[PDB]
Amino acid sequence: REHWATRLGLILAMAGNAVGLGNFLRFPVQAAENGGGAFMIPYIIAFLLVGIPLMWIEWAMGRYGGAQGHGTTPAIFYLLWRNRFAKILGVFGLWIPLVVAIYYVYIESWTLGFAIKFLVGLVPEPPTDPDSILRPFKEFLYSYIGVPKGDEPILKPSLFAYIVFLITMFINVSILIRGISKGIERFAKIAMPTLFILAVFLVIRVFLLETPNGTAADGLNFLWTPDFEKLKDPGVWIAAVGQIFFTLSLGFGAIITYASYVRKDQDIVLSGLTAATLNEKAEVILGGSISIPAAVAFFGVANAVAIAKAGAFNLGFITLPAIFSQTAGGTFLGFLWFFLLFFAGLTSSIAIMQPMIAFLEDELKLSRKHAVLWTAAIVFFSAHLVMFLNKSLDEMDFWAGTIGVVFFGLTELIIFFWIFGADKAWEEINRGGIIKVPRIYYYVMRYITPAFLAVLLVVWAREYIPKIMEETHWTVWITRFYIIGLFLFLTFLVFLAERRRN
Ligand SMILES: CC(C)C[C@H](N)C(=O)O
Ligand code: NA
Ligand code: NA
């Protein structure tokens, strides 16, 4: 089996997995919608009671499986629990990352396309009226991905966007095809440093922004000022947990796959802890100190929150660059912003494609080259669904990147810390660890975490089961139909892999 060359390379590879579009895009929005400081309390709690224990659990399961030549859940679940149903459940460890990757890579191609156009200097040129400053960039984004005037189902992506998406796919392949140590590890040792330093630079510059309407400092205050009146709102907790799962790449089966390349005897405790800690630093300190504080600076808190509630891409692809355009060298600043997003997204996109590749290599015994090329083909082909179908991206993000990851996180924990045995799991987690997990986390993993996730899922289902059936748009049923097709497709490959073994 292939392994990580150095401990450092391992750490930065995992950090590149977590730290991504979720930090500079999803987080600012989630925190803004949930009342800044009021969102932070549940967020931290969710990080302690959910993020860390699951992180360690996934690392353990990964290395455990990897030692026997299996990096994906279909096999690993079976190793932890003997049952056909264990394999069927493990199919999500492939379905989830694949579905998410389909649209994730596309968003990543956006940041790239933007990074290019902003570098060359081809951008809209605003003239004191907020709308007259934002409108040009709204039209700019809409022209790029091809957004309809009214609410129309079909998207018309510009040739440039499509070509950029091809390039993005190429870059992803060029990295993945070189292997774990030579391809992913090498890139991580470069991208991450660049990323952190670009992020750092952007946080400085942004913090310097101050206008008659507000300051970046007002934004930092808003984000870090505690509010206890929102603690009784379940929605805040649900959003916090969802963000923790997404940002830490938990429930995507990515962490597990990466961990399967860690040598049986190498530490996963301190490594895992360090990776997660880096992500949070990149999330709360970097991610939350760029977008929000800038919006608040120019438009004020109220408007900033309104803009955040407007959409997820509205703050990242429209508001921020529009704000930069009003400053000296704002065009170049916008470039660094999209270059940062691109490197963050690229480091994550490769991570959610690897689980599929690892399955083909491990279970179907395909060469790395073939495994990568076929994975890219599937993603690229499926991407047309997200590219040309409005609301398809949202549907995938929801079913896979929201519900799926939580459901899968609960499943893997139940299989590992319950069926497989709590003590055995604990012993497996701490084995070889440079430091040992606090004893208390034993009771967190076995009782607290699973219960909280279960309650969450129950609450969700109660609200969603009626809404699903009554949804007017056909694009979602097409998306649903197709991803269900993808699931069946993957189950069939597992069947073949199972048959080859015999
Ligand atoms: C799906 C995951 C790879 C997402 C990543 N953890 C992020 O924060 O963007
Ligand atoms: Na990343
Ligand atoms: Na992240």
TrEMBL record:
CDD domains attached to this UniProt entry: LeuT-like_sbd
Gene Ontology terms describing biological process: sodium ion transmembrane transport
Transmembrane segments: 8-25, 37-57, 88-107, 159-178, 190-208, 236-261, 282-307, 335-360, 372-392, 398-420, 440-462, 474-497
Membrane topology value: Multi-pass membrane protein
Signal sequence residues: none
Binding-site positions, phosphocholine 1: 84
Keyword Transferase set for record: no
Keywords for this protein: Membrane, Transmembrane, Transmembrane helix, Transport
Subcellular locations according to the entry: Membrane
Sequence positions that bind phosphocholine 2: 84
Chief location: membrane
Statement: the UniProt record of this protein carries the keyword Membrane: yes
Stored PROSITE patterns: NA_NEUROTRAN_SYMP_3
Cellular component GO terms held in the UniProt record: plasma membrane
Coiled coil: none
Alphabetized InterPro entries for the sequence: Na/ntran_symport (IPR000175), SNS_sf (IPR037272)
PANTHER family: TRANSPORTER
Protein name: Na(+):neurotransmitter symporter (Snf family)
Organism: Aquifex aeolicus (strain VF5)
